[PDB]
Design an enzyme around this catalytic site. Sequence first.
Site, PDB file in Angstrom:
ATOM      1  N   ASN A 100      85.546  -9.097  35.947  1.00  0.00           N
ATOM      2  CA  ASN A 100      86.610  -9.856  36.631  1.00  0.00           C
ATOM      3  C   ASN A 100      88.010  -9.160  36.623  1.00  0.00           C
ATOM      4  OD1 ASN A 100      87.468 -13.448  36.340  1.00  0.00           O
ATOM      5  ND2 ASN A 100      88.609 -11.760  37.370  1.00  0.00           N
ATOM      6  N   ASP A 199      88.163  -9.293  41.339  1.00  0.00           N
ATOM      7  CA  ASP A 199      87.043 -10.050  40.731  1.00  0.00           C
ATOM      8  C   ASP A 199      85.743 -10.004  41.566  1.00  0.00           C
ATOM      9  OD1 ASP A 199      85.279 -11.918  39.601  1.00  0.00           O
ATOM     10  OD2 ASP A 199      86.532 -13.705  40.076  1.00  0.00           O
ATOM     11  N   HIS A 355      84.372 -12.841  50.408  1.00  0.00           N
ATOM     12  CA  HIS A 355      84.187 -11.446  50.093  1.00  0.00           C
ATOM     13  C   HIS A 355      83.084 -10.865  50.986  1.00  0.00           C
ATOM     14  CE1 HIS A 355      86.255 -11.397  45.899  1.00  0.00           C
ATOM     15  NE2 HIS A 355      86.342 -10.094  46.178  1.00  0.00           N
ATOM     16  N   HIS A 389      89.565  -9.648  48.796  1.00  0.00           N
ATOM     17  CA  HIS A 389      90.996  -9.312  48.640  1.00  0.00           C
ATOM     18  C   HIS A 389      91.359  -7.920  49.179  1.00  0.00           C
ATOM     19  CE1 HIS A 389      91.659 -13.014  46.122  1.00  0.00           C
ATOM     20  NE2 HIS A 389      90.628 -12.637  45.402  1.00  0.00           N
ATOM     21  N   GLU A 414      95.066  -4.970  43.946  1.00  0.00           N
ATOM     22  CA  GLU A 414      94.883  -5.880  42.842  1.00  0.00           C
ATOM     23  C   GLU A 414      94.864  -5.183  41.508  1.00  0.00           C
ATOM     24  OE1 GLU A 414      92.442  -9.319  40.492  1.00  0.00           O
ATOM     25  OE2 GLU A 414      92.039  -8.965  42.695  1.00  0.00           O
ATOM     26  N   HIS A 416      95.091  -6.853  38.510  1.00  0.00           N
ATOM     27  CA  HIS A 416      95.003  -7.921  37.577  1.00  0.00           C
ATOM     28  C   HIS A 416      95.045  -7.480  36.116  1.00  0.00           C
ATOM     29  CE1 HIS A 416      93.386 -12.156  37.081  1.00  0.00           C
ATOM     30  NE2 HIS A 416      94.343 -11.871  36.191  1.00  0.00           N
ATOM     31  N   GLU A 459      97.027 -11.015  42.575  1.00  0.00           N
ATOM     32  CA  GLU A 459      97.349 -10.966  41.159  1.00  0.00           C
ATOM     33  C   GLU A 459      97.688  -9.613  40.656  1.00  0.00           C
ATOM     34  OE1 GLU A 459      93.818 -13.544  40.166  1.00  0.00           O
ATOM     35  OE2 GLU A 459      92.826 -11.573  40.444  1.00  0.00           O
ATOM     36  N   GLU A 535      94.027 -20.301  46.683  1.00  0.00           N
ATOM     37  CA  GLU A 535      92.737 -20.519  46.066  1.00  0.00           C
ATOM     38  C   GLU A 535      92.866 -21.904  45.464  1.00  0.00           C
ATOM     39  OE1 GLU A 535      91.824 -17.404  43.250  1.00  0.00           O
ATOM     40  OE2 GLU A 535      92.440 -15.888  44.710  1.00  0.00           O
ATOM     41  N   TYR A 536      91.831 -22.745  45.611  1.00  0.00           N
ATOM     42  CA  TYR A 536      91.751 -24.098  45.025  1.00  0.00           C
ATOM     43  C   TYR A 536      90.298 -24.531  44.964  1.00  0.00           C
ATOM     44  CZ  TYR A 536      90.920 -26.766  49.375  1.00  0.00           C
ATOM     45  OH  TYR A 536      90.337 -27.269  50.562  1.00  0.00           O
ATOM     46  N   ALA A 537      89.942 -25.480  44.110  1.00  0.00           N
ATOM     47  CA  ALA A 537      88.560 -25.986  43.981  1.00  0.00           C
ATOM     48  C   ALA A 537      87.408 -24.981  43.782  1.00  0.00           C
ATOM     49  CB  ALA A 537      88.248 -26.944  45.119  1.00  0.00           C
ATOM     50  N   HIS A 538      87.199 -24.556  42.524  1.00  0.00           N
ATOM     51  CA  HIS A 538      86.189 -23.577  42.087  1.00  0.00           C
ATOM     52  C   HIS A 538      84.745 -23.956  42.364  1.00  0.00           C
ATOM     53  CE1 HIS A 538      85.434 -20.095  39.223  1.00  0.00           C
ATOM     54  NE2 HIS A 538      86.352 -19.643  40.086  1.00  0.00           N
ATOM     55  N   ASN A 595      81.114  -7.172  30.888  1.00  0.00           N
ATOM     56  CA  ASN A 595      80.928  -7.960  32.084  1.00  0.00           C
ATOM     57  C   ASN A 595      81.320  -9.412  31.877  1.00  0.00           C
ATOM     58  OD1 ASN A 595      78.254  -8.338  30.800  1.00  0.00           O
ATOM     59  ND2 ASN A 595      78.201  -9.800  32.558  1.00  0.00           N
ATOM     60  N   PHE A 599      80.365 -15.856  36.047  1.00  0.00           N
ATOM     61  CA  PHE A 599      81.675 -15.827  36.644  1.00  0.00           C
ATOM     62  C   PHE A 599      81.740 -15.309  38.071  1.00  0.00           C
ATOM     63  CE2 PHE A 599      83.821 -18.633  34.615  1.00  0.00           C
ATOM     64  CZ  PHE A 599      83.938 -18.449  33.238  1.00  0.00           C
ATOM     65  N   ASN A 602      80.616 -18.388  42.370  1.00  0.00           N
ATOM     66  CA  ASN A 602      81.521 -19.511  42.663  1.00  0.00           C
ATOM     67  C   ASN A 602      81.442 -19.957  44.124  1.00  0.00           C
ATOM     68  OD1 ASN A 602      82.636 -18.464  40.198  1.00  0.00           O
ATOM     69  ND2 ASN A 602      83.877 -16.990  41.446  1.00  0.00           N
ATOM     70  N   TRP A 997      87.853 -22.672  34.052  1.00  0.00           N
ATOM     71  CA  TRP A 997      88.165 -22.105  32.755  1.00  0.00           C
ATOM     72  C   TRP A 997      89.000 -23.017  31.880  1.00  0.00           C
ATOM     73  CZ3 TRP A 997      88.616 -20.230  37.261  1.00  0.00           C
ATOM     74  CH2 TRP A 997      89.874 -20.296  37.887  1.00  0.00           C
TER      75      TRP A 997
HETATM   76 MG   LIG Z   1      91.003 -11.007  39.224  1.00  0.00          MG
END
Ligand SMILES: [Mg+2]
Lengths: 1021, 1021
Positions: A100, A199, A355, A389, A414, A416, A459, A535-538, A595, A599, A602, A997
Amino acid sequence: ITDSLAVVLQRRDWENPGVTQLNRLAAHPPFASWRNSEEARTDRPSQQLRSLNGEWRFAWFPAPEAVPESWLECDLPEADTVVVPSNWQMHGYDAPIYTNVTYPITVNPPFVPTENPTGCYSLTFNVDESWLQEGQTRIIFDGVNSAFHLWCNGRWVGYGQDSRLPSEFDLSAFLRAGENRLAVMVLRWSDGSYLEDQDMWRMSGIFRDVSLLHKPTTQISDFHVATRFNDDFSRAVLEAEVQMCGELRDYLRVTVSLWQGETQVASGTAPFGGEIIDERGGYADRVTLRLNVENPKLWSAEIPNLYRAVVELHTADGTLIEAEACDVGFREVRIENGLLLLNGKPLLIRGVNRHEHHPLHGQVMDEQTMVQDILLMKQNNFNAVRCSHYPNHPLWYTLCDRYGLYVVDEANIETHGMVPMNRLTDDPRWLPAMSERVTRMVQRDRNHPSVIIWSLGNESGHGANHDALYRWIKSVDPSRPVQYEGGGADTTATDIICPMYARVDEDQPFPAVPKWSIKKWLSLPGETRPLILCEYAHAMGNSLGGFAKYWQAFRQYPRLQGGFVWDWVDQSLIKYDENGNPWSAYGGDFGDTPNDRQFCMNGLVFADRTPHPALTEAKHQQQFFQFRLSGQTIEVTSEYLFRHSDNELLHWMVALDGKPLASGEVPLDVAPQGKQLIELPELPQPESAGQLWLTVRVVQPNATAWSEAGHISAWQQWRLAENLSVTLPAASHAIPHLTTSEMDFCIELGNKRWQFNRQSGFLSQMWIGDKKQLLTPLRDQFTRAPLDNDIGVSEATRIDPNAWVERWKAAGHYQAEAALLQCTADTLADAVLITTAHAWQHQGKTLFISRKTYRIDGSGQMAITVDVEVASDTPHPARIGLNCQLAQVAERVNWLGLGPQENYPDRLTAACFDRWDLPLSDMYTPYVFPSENGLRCGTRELNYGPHQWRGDFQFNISRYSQQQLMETSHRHLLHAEEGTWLNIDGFHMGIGGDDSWSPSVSAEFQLSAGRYHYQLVWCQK
Amino acid sequence: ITDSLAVVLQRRDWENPGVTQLNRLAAHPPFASWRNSEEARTDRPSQQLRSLNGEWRFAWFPAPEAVPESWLECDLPEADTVVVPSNWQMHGYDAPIYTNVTYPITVNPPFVPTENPTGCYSLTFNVDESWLQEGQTRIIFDGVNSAFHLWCNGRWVGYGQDSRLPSEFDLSAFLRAGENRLAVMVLRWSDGSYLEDQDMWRMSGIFRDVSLLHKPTTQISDFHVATRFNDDFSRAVLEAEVQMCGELRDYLRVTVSLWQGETQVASGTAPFGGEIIDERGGYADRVTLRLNVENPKLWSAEIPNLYRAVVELHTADGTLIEAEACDVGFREVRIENGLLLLNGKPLLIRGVNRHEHHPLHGQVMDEQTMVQDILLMKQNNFNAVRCSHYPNHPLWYTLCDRYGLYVVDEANIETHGMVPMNRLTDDPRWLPAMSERVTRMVQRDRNHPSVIIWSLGNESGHGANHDALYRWIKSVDPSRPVQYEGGGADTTATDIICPMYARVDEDQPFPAVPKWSIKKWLSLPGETRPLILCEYAHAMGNSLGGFAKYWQAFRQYPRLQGGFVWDWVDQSLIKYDENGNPWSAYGGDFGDTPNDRQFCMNGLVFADRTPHPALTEAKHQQQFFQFRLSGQTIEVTSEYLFRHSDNELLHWMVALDGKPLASGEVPLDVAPQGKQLIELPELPQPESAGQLWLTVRVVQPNATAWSEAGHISAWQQWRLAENLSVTLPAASHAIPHLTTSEMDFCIELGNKRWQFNRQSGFLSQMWIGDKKQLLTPLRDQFTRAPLDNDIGVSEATRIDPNAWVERWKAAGHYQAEAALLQCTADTLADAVLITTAHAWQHQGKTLFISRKTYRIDGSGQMAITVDVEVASDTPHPARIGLNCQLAQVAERVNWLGLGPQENYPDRLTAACFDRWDLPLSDMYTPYVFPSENGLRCGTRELNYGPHQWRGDFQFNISRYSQQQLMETSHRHLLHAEEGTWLNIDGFHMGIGGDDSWSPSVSAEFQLSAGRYHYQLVWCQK
Ligand SMILES: [Mg+2]
Ligand SMILES: [Mg+2]
Ligand SMILES: [Mg+2]
Ligand SMILES: [Mg+2]
């Protein structure tokens, strides 16, 4: 000699943020160098543009330097033949790594590892002799992950970084006639990897097309289309800025024609030379044409009205030098006064994050997949999408343009995994690099009308480099807003507040970058920008709970323009067993370390495009028509802005507990944003007992480019009246026998025979004749094989004590131990009264108490009553019910309740109260990481085998134990149990989803009342 | 091998704007790495910082490819030992070029001419065994113009572009204990050349310094200082940010102490690790300190209050590692509401633009030239300097910090010669390149209190790339305003309207980039920013006319906060003759092609730092006190913002026609922005004819850092009264005799005889005794030897018909022939009357006409009366007076008029009415490019030898005719003529100078009346 791997690799450009490319052509909108307007107009394929996709020679190496100089001259021998495009991990060269945040390599910018999985691609091809006569011959790489070197005919050509944008070289002077050879040195990691920490699975290779383009020497070199409108959109100017390349001559001309179909709408002719610009002059090598367009047809996701713009480079006496073209969409994207308006009306973004993923192909996109995804979205009330992304494969834009989806085109940046996140984004030295990920994306995609929002990456925190870069965009393409979420979602580098996972009603004030309740954020002193969740609601596993909560704010607050779900597809990858049978693998299942397991999954739909249940929740919430019932007037509202209810019919139907009493249909005549009054015929009323439900559905009588005929667009249900049952059953013609022992109690009536275990205190068995039913006694249950949301980021290594599962475990929910406090058989007038009390305890804490009375009667029917007590100081139970494993193993299942699909409490709006009949199989939901599932809430009557159960419960039924599910990491390892397992719940906790999370379940969804009461009635047929 | 020239040179990185550096360390504020805090404190020099300035060996080559591998290995037998820093053109290797817009090379980005003068420098030096055990040793090049490669001990080190910024490389691993040798090869042209198209001689080489720096392994890698204030400025906060390099050990601390002189004022100690920044945390390797400073001494140009910051990097036992330091300036720079405020009050920039230019060193600067310049500026009432047009030698910031100048720091970016100008600045391929030219300047200069504004470069048009860079700065450093003039002076890339050459009340509405009058610009709709000229009052040759108009506005319009004059020094160079004499040279004299001639010389001081007369005008106009006289109360207004007149004596005085009747001497006690009332003693009054004048001077009794004692800072005069002469010169004891003849008339009066040529109309000759006086008949004069301003950009090959000269030329002015219309001598009672009339004509058009009367009395005095008629259609003449060449040659000149310096109608405010006496030599102005000069307005009396001219004229008197001036290219070629050429003007037209490439004389100063009347009284005493 200076082409030698030797000399070349010397420099180690892959370990220098200050070398991003070597000998790279400028970026630009997609070209095809046509030489026949007509084709160009019709988008007929170009004879000037050749694909070199296919069979190719590849050979993998541990590191760069292990490459042998021979390779530049002749093909290696062990060189396997491979297909291009592809990802080599997809070929078994190395492992695909699912990480991630955490970087795949060791953080030492700008250094990468010596052990640098290099892959060598090669290709022998013949060029027409004609190609070398005139024109230029360039080559194109639509994406090469992560960096590479290149050689043609043994000679070095160039270098390039950024896996998501095309790299183009001029082959003109290196190819010979006939037989030519390509030598591509794709390195796995580069200084550019430090900027691609998204991610997702980390792979490599030439994953997008490769092609050849031959342009004339005097050619068109870039072009932009622009559309300005008057105040009422009744008229627009199409403005084109065209730049050429080559020696300029007074005979050169430029015509730009606008077509609507076959019909030519506008045409403009002009010679090179721009307006004055500064004290030095203008571009002599540019020209801008303005076409006057009246009562133009506007582009929306609602109606993708496109035009075709053809651009011709010709001489005055008409000779055509070459043509290019693009689809044109007349739209105006503007943020005005807190609002994000499209063509003047304020948008409501129903979109999702996606993606470029293929279970099989890795990160190679194809036309089919694309198309598929879109129609699914479209079908499910999606409007928009985010290229989370990085800039996507080129066709994507064209499909969205053509089909109607708003795209948020996003830069491939990115970082992150840095501490702080800004470390690079705030480092002048990283300026240039980022710079190019921004500039080129814009210069390539800027002509698509689907792009309406440019993003700066993800991010990467907030750095002085983002501000600069955003300033650039604004300067160069004022046509669109820019947005970027890093650093707190409201930085000065975004035109929109675009947080990820902000909660509707609850704040998360984290230092430096909190997450205010979305409604709250808007009024923060100062604040005036629209809010659209990036981004909202996983959609992670059994999720999407609370979904509606969101849909409701969106609708009440103007400045809340919706948002993008995380995310579309499961980034799961296919693997094969000891028998070439496949299975869905996730992080670290490739021996990949470090790893992040599940995750990576989703999605809203399986990695094979078979949908997850949540998908319907989304579909109903995101629906374009809304209703309200008043008496028998249904009021219908259009949530469309441009279109008209011109392919919709309303189906209405009235039913009594599954029995249809009435149906009719009405055609919708609502304007976008408009209302429509519907009155229903005197509705039926029964004398009969039971709930009257009204259900309306909106139908598409006609097929579209993305929907079938008879496709249901929306729906809604109301309970009308209830006719309480005041008919006390016939006082059973016989009475039940009871027989006793020190071991148990047995009740007998007919062939029917129950039996309670005096020790334990539970119904241990039951017969219908010589047949038994239970395999497992019927006992109380207060747990559930945890959902992903329940677990979160807890691992045996590192424990998340706040995570639900951790809490339940800790409190001993999972290892409780019953205790018989009492168990009494009593005899009544016409019944039998069994009576129990058990106490659940872990370490001398009574967790729960379950008090019960079974009351069998002469009809051979037992009525269970349950009354549980839950201790105030124990984490609230996942659930509260009974369960048991029967022996029968029937094909179907049939209940009167919500469905047909799996519904949980905080996710049950898309479901309907009806009489459903399904195969057992459809009763299990094939989440890849096993967990509680298939629950159906609001059930009034269940039926399986000869048994029937009745009352108000949630239930679920599979051939898997709650415990099997819980000790199995993959759905593929599950095995059916001996008979049907049954879970009947009076109560079930929420599912959560706001994020995976941290704890997502909202109070009203938690089982925290202390006392629960429920009843059942079991019986047979 | 890979070090080989061949391998290296092969990638032609100086032909690619992508690679701009290779292995160069990052930028930062000046370090010294003192290992004793006191030395840091007191600025004592660092044992750790070593200079390589000196004797190097050098070999010039016509090309990079002409270099012989050997070079890397060994020095060259024919290599010349040469000094460093320096400019090779300053040596003879090639020719310096003096070109303005037009690029030196041929415009073909990113390409450079194959033939590219290359200079190999090399040096053999010693390394201290100690430097090689610990820490890092690195090398600093303060300026390598324009690009370069570095070798160490035959190894390749790295590459650099950007001529005006340091490039530092770590030599750490290439230094062998003892003898190392350097191998530097500088390229004259690189792709970086495209961004260095500034108007200046074009040279090359290693023009700044080369040093070695030894830092520890755990060191201080950058630090910025910042200072907030409170409303009234009673408390400040010094905030310091420290970043480090090396490995972070818990026992590491940092301490930043603030000293004011001897006395410590504030201190802070802490350890690494900053506050949470984002989702990932903070910088472990950074720290920020905030020290409180109550009532800080404030920094300005009026008073340079400066503190000393010491940044110590130590262990917790208090063991030092390294220390860094800088001078601190407590000042606040803000643009509030239209106005640019300094420490709360609003500025008025008394500035000039300055180049690093030494007539001898070419572009290498030294501390002594820097000092000089400042001191002269300060003396002359300058306040600020703008670094035209690149970052300067580091010392320069420090002297300004300490002496008191406001600096505009500007990027080394000017692509003036492109078409259009935007061409590269609007291209993303050029972003990185520019990005670096800005970011590095900021990383380096950011800590000087002298820098109040950042500029993105010069004349490069306006492009997306400025916008981004501009935003980049704002983000990174909000303490200063950004400015850029490109694209119209009002773009989005500037915080200030910073136009160049904008006229006071007249507009110049160019297409796209109009130059509105400045008063008017402000008031445009929407406009609200302040206005400061980046260039104005173009000071080329005989210039500076109208300067006062500019001053008047600044002072009347608040948002007009002054400007920077163009420019400081003359970019002329020193050439040597046959006999070994020096002589000022300019564009073209080095055989430069193409070149812009005298265009390189626009300064206020000669290159030898000797003032040009214009200097005085500026010094007066920009003076800090203003006067108003009322009755006999002088009211002094102070324009100082911060300081009180604490070193100022007002000396006053009164005279009648150069005869001082009186003077006082008050002491000024005025506070910044205050008034002072000066009531004067009852001043005399004589019966005598004459004008009574009040002069007042403001003196500085106390010598300062930049001023002597008795220095004069302000002045002003007023005529107080005129007593009219109502007396007639006594009864002539005699009467002149006229002796007639065919060709002439003769008058005799005692030993004095005069003759008028009856064929020409002129006074041909005059004798005193047997002494002839004229060498040239006294005739009429209409034209002048063209000022640079009269000429403009009119060349021989291409004429600008609007240039004043071109107009005079075409009209005939220069070559019209006189025409005896009438000539009559008459006999009066006691006088002789001569009466002539001539017409001047060309192509048979009378341009002008002059009617005169000479009249001689018994006094031996001829009063000449003149009356001229100018034809309407003809271009107004330059001047209207007479001239002749006398025979005498004297040593002094005495006159009673405006002086003592050259003064012209539109440039005479600074001059004073009084009796002056100078030596003839001081009556000629050595403008390198000879022109009408040395004029003296307002004369009422002039004496040379025996003559005495009386009246109201303007004059000038040298040993050079206008013809010489005219046909002479350089002042050095001018020869003195037989006698003394005298010019007596009843009228002269203004000099202009708003700019040197278009008509600049304001209407008010043009001789456009038609009829002109004036009268002399020639006589002898
Ligand atoms: Mg990330
Ligand atoms: Mg690189
Ligand atoms: Mg370069
Ligand atoms: Mg210039």
